[PDB]
Amino acid sequence: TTVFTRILDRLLDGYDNRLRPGLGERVTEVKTDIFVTSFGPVSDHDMEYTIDVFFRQSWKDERLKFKGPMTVLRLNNLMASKIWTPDTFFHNGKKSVAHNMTMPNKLLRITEDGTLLYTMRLTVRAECPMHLEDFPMDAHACPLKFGSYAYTRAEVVYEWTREPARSVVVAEDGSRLNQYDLLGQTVDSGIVQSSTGEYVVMTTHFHLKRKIGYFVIQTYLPCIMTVILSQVSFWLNRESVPARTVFGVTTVLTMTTLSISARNSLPKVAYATAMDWFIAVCYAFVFSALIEFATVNYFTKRGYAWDGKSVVPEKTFNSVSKIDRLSRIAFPLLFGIFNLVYWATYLNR
Amino acid sequence: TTVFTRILDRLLDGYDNRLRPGLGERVTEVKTDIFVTSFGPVSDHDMEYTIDVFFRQSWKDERLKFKGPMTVLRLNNLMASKIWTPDTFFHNGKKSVAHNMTMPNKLLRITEDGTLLYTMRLTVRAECPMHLEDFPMDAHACPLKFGSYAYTRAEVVYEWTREPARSVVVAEDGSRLNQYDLLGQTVDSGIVQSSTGEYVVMTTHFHLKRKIGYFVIQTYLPCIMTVILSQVSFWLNRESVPARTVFGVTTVLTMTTLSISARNSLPKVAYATAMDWFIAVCYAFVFSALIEFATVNYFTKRGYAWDGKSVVPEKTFNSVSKIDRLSRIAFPLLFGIFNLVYWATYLNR
Amino acid sequence: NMSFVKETVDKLLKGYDIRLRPDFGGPPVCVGMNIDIASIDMVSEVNMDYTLTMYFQQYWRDKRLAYSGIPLNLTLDNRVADQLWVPDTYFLNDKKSFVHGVTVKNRMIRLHPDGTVLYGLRITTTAACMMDLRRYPLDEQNCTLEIESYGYTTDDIEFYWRGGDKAVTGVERIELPQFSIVEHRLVSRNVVFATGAYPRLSLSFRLKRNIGYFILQTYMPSILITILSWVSFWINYDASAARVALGITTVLTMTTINTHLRETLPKIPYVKAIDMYLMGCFVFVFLALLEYAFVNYIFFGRGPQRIPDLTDVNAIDRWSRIVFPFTFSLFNLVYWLYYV
Amino acid sequence: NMSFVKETVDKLLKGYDIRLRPDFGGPPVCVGMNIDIASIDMVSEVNMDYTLTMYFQQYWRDKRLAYSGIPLNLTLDNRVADQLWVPDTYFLNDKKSFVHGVTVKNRMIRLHPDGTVLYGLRITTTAACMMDLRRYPLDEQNCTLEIESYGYTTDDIEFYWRGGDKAVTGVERIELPQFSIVEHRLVSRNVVFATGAYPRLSLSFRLKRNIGYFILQTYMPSILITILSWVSFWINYDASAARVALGITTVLTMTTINTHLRETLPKIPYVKAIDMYLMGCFVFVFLALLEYAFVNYIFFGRGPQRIPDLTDVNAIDRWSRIVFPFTFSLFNLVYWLYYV
Amino acid sequence: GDVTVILNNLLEGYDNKLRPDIGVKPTLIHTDMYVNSIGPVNAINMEYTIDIFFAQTWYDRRLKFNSTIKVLRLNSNMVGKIWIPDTFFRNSKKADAHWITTPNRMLRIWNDGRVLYTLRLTIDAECQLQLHNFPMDEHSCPLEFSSYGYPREEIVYQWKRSSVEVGDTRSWRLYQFSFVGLRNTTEVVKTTSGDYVVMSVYFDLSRRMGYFTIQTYIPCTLIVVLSWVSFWINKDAVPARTSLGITTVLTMTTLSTIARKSLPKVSYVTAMDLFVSVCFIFVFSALVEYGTLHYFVSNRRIAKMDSYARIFFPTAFCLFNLVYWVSYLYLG
Numbered sequence A, B: 001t002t003v004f005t006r007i008l009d010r011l012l013d014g015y016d017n018r019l020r021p022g023l024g025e026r027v028t029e030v031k032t033d034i035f036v037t038s039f040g041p042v043s044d045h046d047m048e049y050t051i052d053v054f055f056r057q058s059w060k061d062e063r064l065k066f067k068g069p070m071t072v073l074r075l076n077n078l079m080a081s082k083i084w085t086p087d088t089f090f091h092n093g094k095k096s097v098a099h100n101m102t103m104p105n106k107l108l109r110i111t112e113d114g115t116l117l118y119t120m121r122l123t124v125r126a127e128c129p130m131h132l133e134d135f136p137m138d139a140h141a142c143p144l145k146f147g148s149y150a151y152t153r154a155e156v157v158y159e160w161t162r163e164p165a166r167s168v169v170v171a172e173d174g175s176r177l178n179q180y181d182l183l184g185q186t187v188d189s190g191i192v193q194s195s196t197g198e199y200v201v202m203t204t205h206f207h208l209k210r211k212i213g214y215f216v217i218q219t220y221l222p223c224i225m226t227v228i229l230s231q232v233s234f235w236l237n238r239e240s241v242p243a244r245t246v247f248g249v250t251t252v253l254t255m256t257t258l259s260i261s262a263r264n265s266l267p268k269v270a271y272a273t274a275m276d277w278f279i280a281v282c283y284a285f286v287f288s289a290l291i292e293f294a295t296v297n298y299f300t301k302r303g304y305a306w307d308g309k310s311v312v313p314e315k316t317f318n319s320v321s322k323i324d325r326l327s328r329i330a331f332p333l334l335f336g337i338f339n340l341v342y343w344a345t346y347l348n349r
Numbered sequence C, D: 001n002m003s004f005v006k007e008t009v010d011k012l013l014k015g016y017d018i019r020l021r022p023d024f025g026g027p028p029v030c031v032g033m034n035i036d037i038a039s040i041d042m043v044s045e046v047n048m049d050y051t052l053t054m055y056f057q058q059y060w061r062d063k064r065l066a067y068s069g070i071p072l073n074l075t076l077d078n079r080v081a082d083q084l085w086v087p088d089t090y091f092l093n094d095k096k097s098f099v100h101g102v103t104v105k106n107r108m109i110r111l112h113p114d115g116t117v118l119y120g121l122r123i124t125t126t127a128a129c130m131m132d133l134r135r136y137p138l139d140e141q142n143c144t145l146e147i148e149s150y151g152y153t154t155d156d157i158e159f160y161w162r163g164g165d166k167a168v169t170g171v172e173r174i175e176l177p178q179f180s181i182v183e184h185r186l187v188s189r190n191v192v193f194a195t196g197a198y199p200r201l202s203l204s205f206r207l208k209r210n211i212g213y214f215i216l217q218t219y220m221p222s223i224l225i226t227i228l229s230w231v232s233f234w235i236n237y238d239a240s241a242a243r244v245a246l247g248i249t250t251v252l253t254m255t256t257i258n259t260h261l262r263e264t265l266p267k268i269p270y271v272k273a274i275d276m277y278l279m280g281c282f283v284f285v286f287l288a289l290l291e292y293a294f295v296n297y298i299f300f301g302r303g304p305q306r307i308p309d310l311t312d313v314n315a316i317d318r319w320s321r322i323v324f325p326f327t328f329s330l331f332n333l334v335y336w337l338y339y340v
Numbered sequence E: 001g002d003v004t005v006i007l008n009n010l011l012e013g014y015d016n017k018l019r020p021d022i023g024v025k026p027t028l029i030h031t032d033m034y035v036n037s038i039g040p041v042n043a044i045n046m047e048y049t050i051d052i053f054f055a056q057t058w059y060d061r062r063l064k065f066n067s068t069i070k071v072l073r074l075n076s077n078m079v080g081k082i083w084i085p086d087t088f089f090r091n092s093k094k095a096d097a098h099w100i101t102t103p104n105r106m107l108r109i110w111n112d113g114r115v116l117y118t119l120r121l122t123i124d125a126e127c128q129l130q131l132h133n134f135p136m137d138e139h140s141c142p143l144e145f146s147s148y149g150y151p152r153e154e155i156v157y158q159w160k161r162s163s164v165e166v167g168d169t170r171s172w173r174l175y176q177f178s179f180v181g182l183r184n185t186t187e188v189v190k191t192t193s194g195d196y197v198v199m200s201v202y203f204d205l206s207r208r209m210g211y212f213t214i215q216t217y218i219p220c221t222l223i224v225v226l227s228w229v230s231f232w233i234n235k236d237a238v239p240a241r242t243s244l245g246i247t248t249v250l251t252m253t254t255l256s257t258i259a260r261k262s263l264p265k266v267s268y269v270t271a272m273d274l275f276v277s278v279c280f281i282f283v284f285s286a287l288v289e290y291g292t293l294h295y296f297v298s299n300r301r302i303a304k305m306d307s308y309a310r311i312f313f314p315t316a317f318c319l320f321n322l323v324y325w326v327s328y329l330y331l332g
């Protein structure tokens, strides 16, 4: 065991981990790839998302060349704190965890030529700005940017280990999304400018499309059924004033409750989503049914309905309202047409 | 530059921070004052309050006398960990925070005679037992007690830096209270006895009076309007049975929602508050107005109302109920009297 | 060459006393501050705070760190920050803050040949700002970050914004769903406590609340319910069940609008601008219901015994059909002109 | 006694290299594992995880730690674990976890004369399991705990369950208020990544959700409301206000039942088993309300013009008195046989 | 300083990795506990918070010293320099020592080697609650502690004379419970790493009834009484009695969900569930009573069903209350 102890002691003898490899000679080049063990839940309200990654970095350090019985030294993570490692950080990250249960989830491997492999298990919570105009039929490209914190591009550059598309790999079973589909990821590289210099940024965009199923069940279907319910009153006799008024008022109250409760999980944006438009038109149809009956009630001459016995020639009885007869067709027809237009508009975006 | 390094090196050379100053020779005397930079929110649910302070402590340590080109060494808070400091803890303290951004929010100052000034910035969460029988018109004296954890009163005694009243100072713009007023503070000191000895405890009581405005808007007014709404049905004709039934049922159900929604702010205490008694009496008035109509309906003979043309000979028509006529006066008067007695009972006290 | 850098850095930290500020016992050390604001979010009226993420840079000269022979600016591993003196900068209104720590502590040290230190930290801080909600949701809030030295007075340290008004960048790119940053202001002053006068830098943002959300959530439902309550005026006086049910529900529907709004706000002891509207709209639906009870009482109470006439219920109903819409628009006219 | 023990223990750590695993550069070190489960709590469908407290014991041999002359298993103060090599075990699906630290770090190191190390930790871990809720609340979940070596491949380390099927205890003493642990099982396998092949131990439980809570809170309230919507079938067809008020209220009540259930679950896009029932009960109370509208339209809409008769109003009511209770029983018969 | 010399002599050659009497006898540790407050009982999580001053006393012969000084009164600085037992709380969900303004720990060493170690703790302790009798339920919430690594042949704990002390219980944060009494026990628990001496404190707690009477029992009772108003309303008022009957059922549904909102989603029937469900039966039957009366008189002794319901319904609810309250307040 002294053979490998003497190698490690020799490597760290006179080693200054405050200095990056090649400091004053060349640019340190860090090869990076990401293995996504789980693409975590997306939070609309916080405009963020969670991602669990094996974050891998590889760079060359000529101070760590060795010759021995082995060609790769697989060491525990406490050796990583003894040498220089890149100061990578996530530009859009919010509160990230480098897991250390039961030990720091890091691996350090040194090959005989000085190449280092340094991976760590991370849980990154990153910002994903969202445009919710098309909500709940919206799609987002959630970014994951990272780079060196202190070293400018004249000192440290990052490159993808393989073809850039193949350097971010998502696990087959690793999906913690509940209402989104991960459609893929685009991987790019760039340069950012700060008050302290120019920095290399490695970018990944995760393309997520929202799954509309929840909002159909909880918002769209209750709205459609309330609108259908409000039009049931067109088939009641015009003398059922307390009955048809309860139809109109209750459906408006239900639409108010649906409208208010439908933005609970969203950020309080100043624009109208696609769902706000749907609830508005559903509100308008429901509101207009009560206005329709009030018009019908305004031309009800008699307070008593047909008794079921007397012939009605053409005592006297009210006739079936012409406004009702037209409403029994126009209201169901205009709502069916609106749904055809509404769903063709957003399901095609 | 090295002149001051040699002073600091000499001070700590042979210094034992395991031993209090004057051990075996005298009682260590710690002067204390608190600057409250903000008086944070009071949590009724947790029966606790937050307070952000500059906790200043001062004591003499002859081991730290020095002679140099300065009379006061204004040192990094790293130095405080090398010397003995009081082990002050808050007796009623819950999870408190020592601020560490961007560096430990502590200052240490050594004068040439050995006197030390040691202040720190703390977010203190302290227990405040509350007697909520008068809620929402309650007042509280939230205590803040502190002293040495390990040193009995024969070893460490605390005193206020100035006159006790002037030793706890609240910043003018620091009020973070939303539903309370900081009337003032009472500052005292005493002895607490444990199984391990007698300890000096320093006490400050902050006097808080709840502001009733939120509960007037959200609880009292909806209750009063509900009671007023239920007495409106006394003015409808006795033959509007569905209309006057909706009046009674709706207001009774509304008071049920008000009662349940009223305690959401409070901890689930097992006694009745002043708000509970108001809601209970409002419930009785609303319930009685429905019971009044049932008695009116029990004496209503004819199912049809006055036709608007026939003269009532004082077919036949029901008369206006004497119960309805009496209730038009009695119910507003008794409820007006109850409000006078209720508010004078609690606002005056 | 790399051995020369290692030797040079070792020489700087040999005999370096981290307990002493630069120019200890002499003139105050001047510290320049830049902030690149990464994001502002979680502006909470419930908690009376906002969360701010920023790149926080401090600039000072420590002559003990001057090095020669290396025509380079030494960027060192951030763990070297624990071997150097750094200002004891703190935020007074800071409630909860942290320096980000993935993959390493988001901290920068960059030495310069003349001894200048650039010390950068990526910080997320939850600072407190008490909000005057009297005009909520048509309100402007002013939320600040108070930067101060804890242990060093103005005899030991001086703060200044490095770059003047260009010290803080990234404010114009901040996008909040509910707010628009009207302006930001940089202040440098001194604050006196019992322990001495301390330098303070204040960064303040003026936040204007977007009202588009509250039109959809609170105002429009309240307006529509109030309009709905006027339908009663077109129903005959004898249809008590219809008009009472219409009147009662609109009064209740106003409560449903208010309770949902109440649940998402702190216990505020005063009347907000949104409360004035809801209580204004509650009066209109309540009076519309009281209008029928008055109409019912005139016909059935005062009928048998024998501004509108106040004896013909049809006149009162037709008077209501004009006055109630007209007064409500007058109420909307006064409300929206006063709060805009 | 204690002089010899202190001399022996000091001898073990002199020259010990914590950077090298046992048998470094040689055969893999075999690590056996026992888990004693203290509790399971906070099985959250909202957060898709469960919280687990356990005593996580690891067993391996380190011949550098063999000692002789002391017929004792040396239980050392747990801080010695910072001086010894220990396996870099981690939980792949672990969202958040900690080792308990009161009154000291809840950790145990026990040496044995031959060099065997017993290393126990008390860990509370919030491990993620994604739950398939298509049969909720009659669902049966399967939540696991992946145990892996991070940096050591199968060439360096081997995992096994110590005691085989008896490696995990305390499962039969767990009380979950909403679930019953039907079964637990232990799996040993290797997992291949881009950096190597790593040993994995997998512990999984099968949680069968209890149904009694949902009978009282969701199923019985829905059945009673559905039954009370049939009362309108016995009400006179003339009483339009009564039957519309009964019809509207039950439809409103079903929504209120659904909203209470809706608010305590994640936003999954599919239909759950509870949604199928509530939708089914909604159809029944909606059709009952549509049944009166049909009765009303037949009598008044088509009456003047002049399997149920479809022209006799009372025939439709008589038909509905039989079909609705029969069909709802048929609906409950099908629904419960499919899900129980 | 003489205390400095004594402290340095004690720690010279001291190995705090080794328990005292490591190969001779078990270490006997005497434990005391002062309860500052038993915090809230969290029924949903089945846990309670307790703030204690936890005191431990043992003997370490390596800490003997001879001098005129009879005891060394020390702060937390030396706590990590000597051996300390690895006491932990076995049912602790989450525990935390206190660190403001310094580690709230006390160390006192006597010349005969006796060590007194005290620290302040806040513990979220697991307490499995059987809520069948809720809200008239009683619990005995445990607090178990033992050694994490040292078995019964190495560490033995022992309650002192004043084992557990409680202060002013009126200041405790027990909103819904009243503290009744405590017991302290000792037992040996066999684990896979050996036999361990486990010390337990049981805190008996009785739930205070007042909140749920205000929150649930009174509202549910009033809605039941509300449904009886229908019996005095004229049977010809079909919309009045149908709306009255059906809105009480809707309200009783809303009250049912509120009552269980503070409980874990246990799948058995508590006393609260029984009361709410029976109140549901009463409001349900009142609507069915009028539907039966309406059908047999209009949509056509049964005709006198209102007179019977005016007595039978108030009497059956009084009778149910008499059985319900007697069984849950004096019976099992």
Ligand SMILES: *[C@@H]1O[C@H](CO)[C@@H](O[C@@H]2O[C@H](CO)[C@@H](O[C@@H]3O[C@H](CO[C@H]4O[C@H](CO[C@H]5O[C@H](CO)[C@@H](O)[C@H](O)[C@@H]5O[C@H]5O[C@H](CO)[C@@H](O)[C@H](O)[C@@H]5O)[C@@H](O)[C@H](O[C@H]5O[C@H](CO)[C@@H](O)[C@H](O)[C@@H]5O)[C@@H]4O)[C@@H](O)[C@H](O[C@H]4O[C@H](CO)[C@@H](O)[C@H](O)[C@@H]4O[C@@H]4O[C@H](CO)[C@@H](O)[C@H](O)[C@@H]4O[C@@H]4O[C@H](CO)[C@@H](O)[C@H](O)[C@@H]4O)[C@@H]3O)[C@H](O)[C@H]2NC(C)=O)[C@H](O)[C@H]1NC(C)=O
Binding pocket: A100, A101, A102, A103, A104, B017, B077, B098, B099, B100, B104, B105, B106, D099, D100, D101, D102, E076, E077, E078, E079, E080, E081, E095, E096, E097, E099, E100, E101, E102, E103
């Ligand atoms: C995964 O990674 C995470 C990190 O990402 C890791 O968490 C870390 O875990 C380690 C332990 O493994 C922690 O380190 C120890 O913490 C001990 C106390 O922990 C409590 O307090 C924490 C904050 O402590 C501050 O305040 C106390 C006093 O109040 C002070 O002693 C500390 O130094 C520290 O002070 C700094 O910060 C404050 C502001 O906060 C400043 O004001 C101050 O100026 C200074 O800068 C707190 O964070 C902890 O909460 C965490 O942990 C608990 C569980 O314990 C958990 O419930 C929480 O949720 C949370 O996670 C906790 O409340 C501390 O005592 C230890 O320090 C010892 O030992 C070190 C050894 O190197 C030594 O350097 C210290 O000086 C000190 O020596 C002791 O001190 C004893 C007490 O005084 C004394 O009895 C001893 O005798 C000895 O005394 C001195 O000894 C020296 C020689 O050594 C001598 O010269 C002196 O004269 C004297 O005799 C140690 O720091 C670390 O805090 C955790 N970090 C975080 C962020 O949580 C996690 O464990 C990892 N998991 C796994 C599985 O690997």
Ligand SMILES: CCCCCCCC/C=C/CCCCCCCC(=O)O[C@H](COC(=O)CCCCCCCCCCCCCCC)COP(=O)([O-])OCC[N+](C)(C)C
Binding pocket: B212, B213, B214, B216, B217, B224, B228, B231, B232, B331, B332, B335, B336, B339, B343, C269, C270, C271, C279, C283
């Ligand atoms: C059938 C008949 C029945 C009859 C029954 C009769 C029963 C009657 C029963 C009456 C009971 C009345 C009880 C009132 C108790 C108030 C206690 C108190 O001090 O409150 C205060 C108000 O607190 C607030 O928040 C103010 C609330 C404002 C409400 C505006 C309503 C607008 C209505 C418009 C209607 C328009 C109508 C138009 C019509 C055309 C509390 O605050 P403060 O302590 O003072 O403040 C201290 C701090 N500062 C601010 C001073 C620094």
Ligand SMILES: CCCCCCCC(=O)OC[C@H](COP(=O)(O)O[C@@H]1[C@H](O)[C@H](O)[C@@H](OP(=O)(O)O)[C@H](OP(=O)(O)O)[C@H]1O)OC(=O)CCCCCCC
Binding pocket: A291, A295, A296, A299, A300, A301, A317, A318, A319, A320, A321, A322, A323, A324, A326, A327, A330
């Ligand atoms: C806010 C908007 C206000 C708009 C107000 C618009 C109001 C408006 O125009 O009312 C007129 C009429 C009323 O219709 P409705 O059939 O309900 O009323 C009949 C109508 O008044 C006849 O004239 C009466 O016969 P008569 O000669 O008196 O013997 C008949 O008396 P009786 O048989 O009961 O004895 C009444 O019942 O409606 C239309 O013509 C429908 C137009 C298309 C409507 C399209 C709607 C989508």
Ligand SMILES: CCCCCCCC(=O)OC[C@H](COP(=O)(O)O[C@@H]1[C@H](O)[C@H](O)[C@@H](OP(=O)(O)O)[C@H](OP(=O)(O)O)[C@H]1O)OC(=O)CCCCCCC
Binding pocket: B291, B292, B295, B296, B299, B300, B301, B317, B318, B319, B320, B321, B322, B323, B324, B326
């Ligand atoms: C909780 C239980 C409470 C039970 C309360 C029981 C209260 C009780 O017993 O009231 C009876 C009486 C009813 O009076 P009310 O005016 O409502 O009823 C009239 C009364 O019955 C006349 O006698 C009838 O005339 P007649 O002679 O038949 O020609 C008249 O019929 P019609 O002329 O319209 O055709 C009825 O309308 O009330 C009072 O006198 C008010 C005193 C204050 C009562 C205050 C009660 C709160």
Ligand SMILES: *[C@@H]1O[C@H](CO)[C@@H](O[C@@H]2O[C@H](CO)[C@@H](O)[C@H](O)[C@H]2NC(C)=O)[C@H](O)[C@H]1NC(C)=O
Binding pocket: E158, E159, E160, E161, E163, E182, E183, E184, E185
């Ligand atoms: C806690 O345990 C102690 C023993 O460790 C109990 O004290 C004993 O009480 C009995 C009462 O009959 C005496 O006979 C013993 O002499 C006591 N033992 C002592 C003082 O060491 C104490 O009662 C227990 N507390 C409880 C059960 O609440």
Ligand SMILES: CCOC(=O)c1cncn1[C@H](C)c1ccccc1
Binding pocket: B217, B218, B221, B222, B223, B225, B226, C254, C255, C258, C275, C278, C279, C280, C282, C283
């Ligand atoms: C006449 C004043 O009463 C009311 O406004 C009133 C009474 N019950 C309900 N409300 C309204 C809905 C309200 C209450 C509180 C805040 C905002 C709006």
Ligand SMILES: CCOC(=O)c1cncn1[C@H](C)c1ccccc1
Binding pocket: A217, A218, A221, A222, A223, A225, A226, D254, D255, D258, D275, D278, D279, D280, D282, D283
């Ligand atoms: C045609 C089926 O529609 C419905 O069941 C329906 C429409 N509006 C409301 N509901 C019910 C209450 C529901 C909504 C969402 C989930 C479960 C049950």
Ligand SMILES: [Cl-]
Binding pocket: A040, A041, A042, A043, A176, A177, A178, A179, A180
């Ligand atoms: Cl998701």
Ligand SMILES: [Cl-]
Binding pocket: B040, B041, B042, B176, B177, B178, B179, B180
């Ligand atoms: Cl407050």
Ligand SMILES: [Cl-]
Binding pocket: E039, E040, E041, E042, E173, E174, E175, E176, E177
């Ligand atoms: Cl409690």
